[PDB]
Amino acid sequence: MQIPASEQETLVRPKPLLLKLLKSVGAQKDTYTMKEVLFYLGQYIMTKRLYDEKQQHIVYCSNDLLGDLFGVPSFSVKEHRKIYTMIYRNLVVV
Numbered sequence: 001m002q003i004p005a006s007e008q009e010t011l012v013r014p015k016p017l018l019l020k021l022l023k024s025v026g027a028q029k030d031t032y033t034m035k036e037v038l039f040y041l042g043q044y045i046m047t048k049r050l051y052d053e054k055q056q057h058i059v060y061c062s063n064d065l066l067g068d069l070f071g072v073p074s075f076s077v078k079e080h081r082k083i084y085t086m087i088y089r090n091l092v093v094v
Contacts, residue, residue: 018090
């Protein structure tokens with residue numbers, strides 16, 4: 001999957017669990033862009049050290065609310081379509 005640059009500007013309203021996670025890294029607001037959603041989720045992952053780089057580029061989230069958000073115990077960061085789908089289940093396009 002290749003995500004076009006224009007999609008970074010897509011306006012979305014997070015559902016409550018995603019909003020909860022976003023508020024731990026960014027300002028709460030009514031609407032976000034997908035650029036913001038991806039950056040903030042990435043920042044959440046990095047700050048909490050959920051990304052294991054050397055364990056086959058895997059994010060581990062079984063002990064974290066991120067796992068509740070996505071409904072998986074872990075995922076490969078290379079699985080872009082799976083990730084993007086999991087994120088989109090937790091928001092509404094404006």
